[PDB]
Design a protein around this ligand. Structure first.
Ligand code: MG
Ligand code: MG
Ligand code: MG
Ligand code: MG
Ligand code: MG
Ligand code: MG
Ligand code: MG
Ligand code: MG
Ligand code: MG
Ligand code: MG
Ligand code: MG
Ligand code: MG
Ligand code: MG
Ligand code: MG
Ligand code: MG
Ligand code: MG
Ligand code: MG
Ligand code: MG
Ligand code: MG
Lengths: 129, 88, 218
RNA sequence: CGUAAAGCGCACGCAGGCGGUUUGUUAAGUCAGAUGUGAAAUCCCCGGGCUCAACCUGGGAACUGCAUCUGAUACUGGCAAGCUUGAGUCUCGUAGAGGGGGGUAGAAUUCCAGGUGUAGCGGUGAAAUGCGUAGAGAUCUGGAGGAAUACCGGUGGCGAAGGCGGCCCCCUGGACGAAGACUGACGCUCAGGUGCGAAAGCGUGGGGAGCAAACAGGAUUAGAUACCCUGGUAGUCCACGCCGUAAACGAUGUCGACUUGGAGGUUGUGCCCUUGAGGCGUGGCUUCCGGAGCUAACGCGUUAAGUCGACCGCCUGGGGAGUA
């Protein structure tokens, strides 16, 4: 159910994107945001927005480049059934180097590139490319 | 299915005021009330399996509620089961 | 900005979902297109049309329906452009090298209608070979001389031209088409919203295409 | 795991697994560095020694592990207090073959009685068994009895599945809708467990019109332990209690989120000179068709067999065997 909301986010992108849908919204959370952040900073989403207060409302702008969408694939990795935790030497690099891996760490939701530099590791939320 | 008169009664017997309809105790109480009433319905008949399903439903619900209470306010729990007269 | 006296929109339920971005309709259980979006598409329509027409325009005004056909055998036909105004013999772009000989027959026949052999053979063979001609005549006029490969294609009703567009899509032939609310776009590189089968939207944009291929480099 | 092996017939629900949202705290999981340890040989890397090699050997590297200390706090778990969208509770109503109990109605069949009537009726492909002069069938009249409820009736409606159709009262389950109010994550799923669960069949009494396993008789047929005909017992009906299986099928487990359309059916409800028998919306349920997509194909397609998550059942060649 609502039990895993991050996969729900991942999928609302995945879906709307394949639906050539301009925006897409969803109930917000601290967590959710910190990710969209990374998605934006790495140029997969266009721009996010949290239009709420009591009942927060994370909202994202999808991009489309050529004819495609910018997100060729968005999978969950960790999940409440089975949590994944890679050290640092073990951090997974997506599409060789292209595309990213969203990982939470003792210091915030970063990208595998970033986390690798940081010198740390953590829960590898999802993969994007 | 329980009298608006009677259901109201109990709301005003277990909650803050009437309107405090969803107060735990109040649910647990007007469930109890029906569950008990019903025991005579199914005293005759007994072959009314279908209706029985709602009654089981009733019990398992009130049970979950009763559980949750004990988890929160163990005081309001004991008070309630004494005063509703169950849990032996 | 509009010019279309009356092509407004057209076509009722049968709308194809993908034709949303070019519709603002609602009148009486039929949608009017986006009057003001058809237009910035004449920008690009006749533009990259005339753009290739100067660099040398070889068009192919593909359009059919016994109620609009002959109204393409005109300045559409006449000027720098060629036309098909009947049943689109499937594979005529895609089998151009099979059909090429369906031309040699047409000529080698009319080139011998008032020429060569004719009033001889039987008084049977006569219009009993112009039944051959009248046939191959329609469906295979605008083929006649081809000279400079089919290069873009102007097509009347996108889906009613299922085949010819698809053919082009295959062959690298930019397909300029006007696509009703009901017709399926995206087969069309240069998409022209609005009505497709009212005697106007045709002649209008139709004759207005002739009127830009016809002249581009003097 | 729709049709190839594979979703328990269905439901509730303990353990367990999973769990919306904010803040604080915790620091077990997780992450970091340090330190110790992880025997030698082996394996691998670069050399060296036997005429080469196999073989021998120096040195690194590796031993992906464990443990202790110290730190990091995003995620997970613990603790605390919240929050309102998830989930419940309350008010009014709507549709309904939802369940249980008691009444009751007309149409028919069979039977009993009688009137009239008289030589056949019945049945098949053709016949015969059968029935009729103790008068059949036919026809009219009255009566008894059980069983099922024409027309409405409809890809109509309800239920968890099984399944539930005359009318009425009584008891009762669920669903949905319009508002607003209260509870405040109280939830999802569920091995074990419990309940329900067509028809057949079993136990005791009862009931028995029609149908009909068995059985008898007549036929057909090379044969006919059948299909057809004349009869007809159990059973089919009620009460109590068993049994627990069906192609128990959508051959598709439940819950939740997301993703173009079109024409109906059904059922609530808001708004418009109600001024059209309506007009524009907005929920629940459903049928056909169809896009992406998915698929071996067939096909599925917002009621997914699409895109995702939580949990559970189950599959691992055919036969043997759902057998011992
Ligand atoms: Mg199978
Ligand atoms: Mg959370
Ligand atoms: Mg060693
Ligand atoms: Mg050597
Ligand atoms: Mg926490
Ligand atoms: Mg009678
Ligand atoms: Mg009678
Ligand atoms: Mg009710
Ligand atoms: Mg049972
Ligand atoms: Mg039975
Ligand atoms: Mg019996
Ligand atoms: Mg018989
Ligand atoms: Mg079975
Ligand atoms: Mg079925
Ligand atoms: Mg099933
Ligand atoms: Mg639809
Ligand atoms: Mg379909
Ligand atoms: Mg699915
Ligand atoms: Mg057995």
């Amino acid at each position: 159910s609502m039990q895993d909301p991050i996969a729900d986010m991942l999928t609302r992108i995945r879906n709307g994107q394949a639906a050539n849908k301009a925006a897409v919204t969803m109930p917000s959370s601290k967590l959710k945001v910190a990710i969209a952040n990374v998605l934006k900073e790495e140029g997969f989403i266009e721009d996010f927005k949290v239009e709420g207060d009591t009942k927060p409302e994370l909202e994202l702008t999808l991009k489309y480049f050529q004819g495609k969408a910018v997100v060729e694939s968005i999978q969950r990795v960790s999940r409440p059934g089975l949590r994944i935790y890679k050290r640092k030497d073990e951090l997974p690099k997506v599409m060789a180097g292209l595309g990213i891996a969203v990982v939470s760490t003792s210091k915030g939701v970063m990208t595998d590139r970033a986390a690798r530099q940081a010198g740390l590791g953590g829960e590898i939320i999802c993969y994007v490319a | 299915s329980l009298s608006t008169e009677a259901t109201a009664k109990i709301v005003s017997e277990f909650g803050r005021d009437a309107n405090d309809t969803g107060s735990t105790e109040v649910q647990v109480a007007l469930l109890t009330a029906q569950i008990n009433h019903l025991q005579g319905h199914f005293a005759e008949h007994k072959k009314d399996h279908h209706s029985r399903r709602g009654l089981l439903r009733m019990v398992s619900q009130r049970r979950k509620l009763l559980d949750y209470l004990k988890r929160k306010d163990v005081a309001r729990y004991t008070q309630l089961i004494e005063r509703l007269g169950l849990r032996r | 900005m509009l010019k279309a006296g009356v092509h407004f929109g057209h076509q009722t339920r049968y709308w194809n979902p993908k034709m949303k971005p070019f519709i603002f309709g609602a009148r009486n259980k039929v949608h009017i297109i986006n009057l003001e979006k058809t237009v910035p598409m004449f920008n690009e329509a006749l533009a990259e049309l005339n753009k290739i027409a100067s660099r040398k325009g070889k068009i192919l005004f593909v359009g059919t329906k016994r109620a609009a056909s002959e109204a393409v055998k005109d300045a559409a036909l006449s000027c720098d452009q060629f036309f098909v105004n009947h049943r689109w013999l499937g594979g005529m772009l895609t089998n151009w090298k099979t059909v090429r000989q369906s031309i040699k027959r047409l000529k080698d026949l009319e080139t011998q209608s008032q020429d060569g052999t004719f009033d001889k053979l039987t008084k049977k063979e006569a219009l009993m070979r112009t039944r051959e001609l009248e046939k191959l005549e329609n469906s295979l006029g605008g083929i006649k001389d081809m000279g400079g490969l089919p290069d873009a294609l102007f097509v009347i009703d996108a889906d009613h031209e299922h085949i010819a567009i698809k053919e082009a899509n295959n062959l690298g032939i930019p397909v300029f088409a006007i696509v009703d609310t009901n017709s399926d776009p995206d087969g069309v590189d240069f998409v022209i919203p609005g009505n497709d089968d009212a005697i106007r939207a045709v002649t209008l944009y139709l004759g207005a295409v002739a009127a830009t291929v016809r002249e581009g480099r003097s």
